[PDB]
Structure formats: structure tokens, C-alpha cells
DNA sequence: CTTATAAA
DNA sequence: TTTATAAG
């Protein structure tokens, strides 16, 4: 089984990821920025009870930690509840970086007709695999209370932060550089957390996929076994249907 | 909820 | 000028 053969590589069996080779990220501020503390709009009990289990899981996982910070941004009061942080005022104060993630159209142009056997993997909770340096953690604080009050913040690259997709894409590229060198006859397309591996034959695709899963797992990333498309001549990738070299 | 942009 | 849409 693809599952049993690579327990470490799958989110379902390997536990929450952590990119062990990647240094905790420091997030540079713009030259003139100072902290902004935005009050939390009062949240209804219904919303709070909805969000609570997610917050607790993240705390248990060490992805959230208590803190006291001069920064504060709101969680959405209406957000099937899940916590969404409005990081816009933080984003405005963070120094911009060059956008290096290719658009899907251009990314797909690197797929040759010679390689028509596909594996598509998506990494689960990808941003959370990247640690934030403790110096940058306070930037992302928000308020949490459970009547029956303090701030929490993220110890990993957060959702809603303007640079997360680019920083993740760049980190995974660094981590997969050797894989590319070891497998010169495979095509690997990276779009943040969405990966396409393409091979000349079913066999090469099988061996390539084994090697990619082993590598991802070893590095601390986790792919979704449920959504995995393995060694197919027809796959869905980035909203396209990849079929016989078309699209 | 707030806010940026677009469409009406 | 208002309304709608989208997104953190």
C-alpha cells in the first residue's frame, strides 16, 4: 500500500509536520513600522464555542502559545466555525518581498509531452510546517478568552500573512533541490503546497513517487493521502485536467 | 466584522 | 452615491 509503505509521508499517519531543515523565519518590518493593537470585536458564544476546539488543538500542538504582545489583530466573529485572523494591519507593516511563485499557467508550460504519467500531492497544513523565529512571533498575536483573558500567538508561519505562500514555496524549493538533482529525468512542479511529479513511464512514476514521499516525510512535510493522485495518466492539478499532455 | 475595489 | 463583491 502507498499508505503503509510511507507512514511518515502522509498527514493521516505521520503526525503534524515540521520542516526540520528550515531555520525559524525572521519577518522583517518596514523601516517605519511600529506595533498596532487592534481591539477584538466581541465574539458571540456560538462563534467562540465553534472556534474553541481548533484553538485547543493548536495549543496542544504547540502551534499556538500564550504571549503578551504590543501587536494584536482580530479573529473574525462570524468566520462550521474555524478561526480566521485579519492580518491586514500587520501585512501593511511588513517589508515586501519579491513574488517568486509562478502563476499556474507559466508553471504548467514546463510540462513536456514526453512525461505523461502523473502523481499529484498536496501538503497538509503546509505553512504550519515552517517555524517562526521567536522574535517574529509577537507580530501575529490575537486575543483569546474562555470565561468558564489573554493573547495567543503563532509559532509557525500563519494563515492570512501576505508572505506565507512565497516563503513556503521558497522553503520547499530549498528542501527539494537535492531530490531534483537525484532524479534528473523526473519533472517536478511546485505551486506552494500543490505538487505535480511527471514521468516518462508508469514504472518511473512509481519509483519517483516513492522517492518523493520518502523525501517529503524525512524533511518533515506531510501529504494528504485522501486526496493523493498516484501514478495516473489523468490528474487534476491547479484546476486543470491533465490528460494526454493537454492543458 | 472590517475594508478594498468594482459595479450598479 | 449606493450597492455588491471579495477577502483577511
Curated annotation (Swiss-Prot):
What phylogenetic lineage does the species belong to? Viruses, Riboviria, Pararnavirae, Artverviricota, Revtraviricetes
Requisite cofactors: Mn(2+); Mg(2+)
| Residues annotated to bind RNA | 41, 86, 88, 102, 163, 165
- Per the UniProt record, the source organism is Moloney murine leukemia virus (isolate Shinnick) (MoMLV)
The miscellaneous comment for this protein is: The reverse transcriptase is an error-prone enzyme that lacks a proof-reading function. High mutations rate is a direct consequence of this characteristic. RT also displays frequent template switching leading to high recombination rate. Recombination mostly occurs between homologous regions of the two copackaged RNA genomes. If these two RNA molecules derive from different viral strains, reverse transcription will give rise to highly recombinated proviral DNAs.
This protein's assembly is summarised as: The reverse transcriptase is a monomer (Potential). Interacts (via RNase domains) with host release factor ETF1; this interaction is essential for translational readthrough of amber codon between viral gag and pol genes, as well as for viral replication.
Q: Which residues bind Mg(2+) 1?
A: 122, 193-194
Q: Can you give the residue ranges of the Reverse transcriptase domain?
A: 59-242
Q: So what does this one do?
A: RT is a multifunctional enzyme that converts the viral dimeric RNA genome into dsDNA in the cytoplasm, shortly after virus entry into the cell. This enzyme displays a DNA polymerase activity that can copy either DNA or RNA templates, and a ribonuclease H (RNase H) activity that cleaves the RNA strand of RNA-DNA heteroduplexes in a partially processive 3' to 5' endonucleasic mode. Conversion of viral genomic RNA into dsDNA requires many steps. A tRNA binds to the primer-binding site (PBS) situated at the 5' end of the viral RNA.
Please share the entry's free-text remark on the cofactor. Binds 2 Mn(2+)/Mg(2+) ions for ribonuclease H (RNase H) activity.
Name recorded for this polypeptide:
Reverse transcriptase/ribonuclease H
> Which part of the entire protein is covered?
683 to 937 of 1738
